Each structure stands twice: as structure tokens, then as C-alpha cells.
Design a protein around this nucleic acid. Structure first.
Lengths: 194, 192
DNA sequence: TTATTTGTATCGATCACTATAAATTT
DNA sequence: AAATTTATAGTGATCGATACAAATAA
């Protein structure tokens, strides 16, 4: 394919952008900040990502596949729905309090409110939080078939509860609540299990 | 001198609504001045700056949607019932359509530019006060007798604060009130 | 040559904000 | 006439985004 070769690694630039979105949220991540962290100039970013909303949408998918695969892994890899939900919440808290990533979950922190211009992005993360509930719900559905959860168990109710705790754990992580306290928060939420 | 053509507490109410919906950085001076129905020079004469306007809208908001919290916790005869009543009333407010859904303190500024770090830090301190409300009501339950003396109060207060903050995210996502009330009943099953 | 990426250097719109002076009081 | 608030019309800075042409390939 003809053309001057690309001088930057696309995946790296995508990763460095998702880090900026993770800390500053979608609207607070300015083009000056994105091009600096990515170590590229604006027209390069627009040639590769089309627009800031397109950059965020690619950054979001990158985040989900690199910081969201562990969710299904520990969920499906558990012998019961309870221990799967337990292990996911413990892994999530350890990740939320790691010295190697921004604190909390991008999906929760990046765009809760904002200008009406960015409503598509907010609806996107909204949809992605509905997936967090659906993820818990699917695992519980397997718990019913395996026998570790009761047949009449209201899966939506129970999934929605642990997604509430999970979303709340992003705010507490952002507020720098110590890891020991959040793991105890997880243990207390597990007491609510049927 | 000349009289002012707006009412300060009313303009503060409209600024609060815009901040509630669009967040601190998302609320432009254009959108604020249109809501309050004042022009920019009147805004800065009365509030100093956008940051000062937000701080006054925050104090205003806490006066309405913050005082009822300690009132509900102390009005109940036990810590458990107090936490329950507060969570139940919060869900109702989070899903009634006079207020925007969910709490301003959780939604207004969780991330943003480095220039707004002070506003974000002020909202975090306010979330720490929610934790402090539960803990203080739990201290009374230990003294009154409805809560065991060796209860880990800080873990229990943080647990219900985590539920509280999560309910804002779910309220913003338009989760129905019935589903949120079930979350509250489910969180009460974790009571010691 | 033709494609494509690159850095420079902007663009118009909007950001938070304010100089200024007319309008409305005492 | 003095005190004060108001509306008009902007400020310089930054926003997301792009025109342009030198640079680098097929």
C-alpha cells in the first residue's frame, strides 16, 4: 500500500489516550492533553481516529478488552455464582486500588454528566454499565442450572444489587478509600447473598 | 442604589439544577446565565466566579437534599431502621421527577481537567461526610443497644455509603424505583 | 508519478470573564 | 446628582477540528 509509513504505533497511541480519558473523563480530556500523551499531532489523530468521539469509542473498546476480560474470566471460572461474584468483586477492588492504573472504573467515571453535546458518549457508557448487570445476571443463570442458586431467584434483582455495589466501588476508589476498607465492603455485600 | 432585577436564592436554584444535570465543567456560563435569567456581569457581581457560583449552589443543594438525611437517621429508634429509612427516602428522591435523578454530589465532578481539582476535592470531602453520617448513627446504635458493641462501624458505614453512591449511578441510568428499592432491601440483608 | 503521513499554523466557535456606560434607584 | 445594577460587547485563551505543503513511501 502506497504512502509515507505511519510514524507511531496505533495501539500505543490508543492506549495512551484511554489513560487520559480514564483520569480526566471524556469531556475533560482535551485535544492538547490527548496529543501530548499520545506523542502525535492533531491531524495524525484525526486521520487515524476520525474525531474525539471516535477516539474515545476506540479507547473504550480497548479498555473493555484489556480491563474487562478479567470480569468474565473469574466469573465463568468459579464453581458457584456466589464465589464468582465474590472473586470478581475482590479482583475489581484490587484493580481499583492498584498503583499501576488510574483508580476506579473508566466506564463509571468518564462521563456521568456533561454538556448535551456529549450525550452519545454518556449513553454509550450507560449501555456498558447495563452490560455489567447483564454479566452478573448471566453467571447467576448458570448458578441456577448448576444447582448453587435457587430456581426462583430473582436474577435481575440480585445482579442489580451487586452492580450497585460495584459502581459505588469506583467512587470510593476515586476517593482513595484504602484497599483494606473496600475488601471489607465486598465481604459485607456477600453477606446479602440469598 | 438601583434595585437588582433577580432573586439571589432563585438564581442559585437554577444554577444548581444546571450543575445537577450537566456537572461542574459541563455547565457553561452561557447555560447558567440562561437558566438564572441574569447576564454575566450580574453573575460575577453576586458569586465572584464560576467556582464560587458552584460552591454556593453546593451549599444551597446540601441545605435541601442534605439536612433531611441526619433527620431521618436520628428519627428512627434504631441504627438499622435509620439506615433503611434514609436509603428508602433517597431512592424516592432519586426517582421523583421534580429533581434530576441521582445525587449532585456524586454526579457533578468525578473526573475533569486539572483546573477543577478543587471542586472535585470538595465533592469528595462531601462524600466522606455521608460516610460520617452513617458511622455517627451507628455509634448511637451501639450506645442505645440496637447494635452490638463490637460491630465494625467503619466497614458498615462504608458499605452503605457504597450502596448510596451506586444508587446515583443507577438512578442516572433510569433504573426503575421498584428495582432500586429492592437493592435497598437487599443491602439491608447485610446488616449484622 | 500518485498516495499517505507529517508538522506548522491556523480556523471559527465557544470558554470563563470583564470594561464600560446606560438605566434605574435615592 | 450619587450609588448601584444592568445590558452590550467584547477580552485573550482554549476548544475541537482542519488547510496546506514538505516528507516519504509505492
Amino acid at each position: 500500500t502506497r504512502g509515507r509509513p505511519r510514524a507511531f504505533d496505533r495501539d500505543t497511541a490508543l492506549q495512551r489516550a484511554m489513560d487520559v480519558f480514564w483520569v480526566r473523563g471524556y469531556e475533560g480530556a482535551s485535544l492538547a492533553a490527548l496529543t501530548e500523551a499520545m506523542e502525535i499531532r492533531p491531524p495524525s489523530l484525526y486521520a487515524a481516529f476520525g474525531s474525539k468521539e471516535g477516539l474515545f469509542r476506540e479507547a473504550l473498546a480497548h479498555y473493555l478488552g484489556q480491563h474487562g476480560r478479567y470480569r468474565r474470566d473469574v466469573l465463568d471460572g468459579a464453581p458457584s455464582a456466589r464465589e464468582g461474584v465474590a472473586e470478581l468483586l475482590r479482583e475489581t477492588v484490587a484493580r481499583f486500588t492498584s498503583d499501576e492504573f488510574p483508580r476506579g472504573c473508566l466506564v463509571v467515571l468518564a462521563a456521568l454528566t456533561g454538556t448535551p453535546e456529549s450525550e452519545a458518549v454518556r449513553d454509550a457508557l450507560s449501555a456498558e454499565r447495563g452490560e455489567s448487570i447483564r454479566l452478573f445476571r448471566e453467571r447467576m443463570r448458570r448458578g441456577i442450572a448448576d444447582g448453587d442458586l435457587a430456581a426462583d431467584t430473582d436474577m435481575e434483582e440480585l445482579a442489580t444489587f451487586y452492580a450497585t455495589v460495584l459502581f459505588g466501588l469506583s467512587v470510593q476508589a476515586k476517593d482513595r478509600v484504602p484497599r483494606e476498607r473496600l475488601l471489607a465492603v465486598v465481604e459485607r455485600a456477600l453477606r446479602a447473598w440469598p
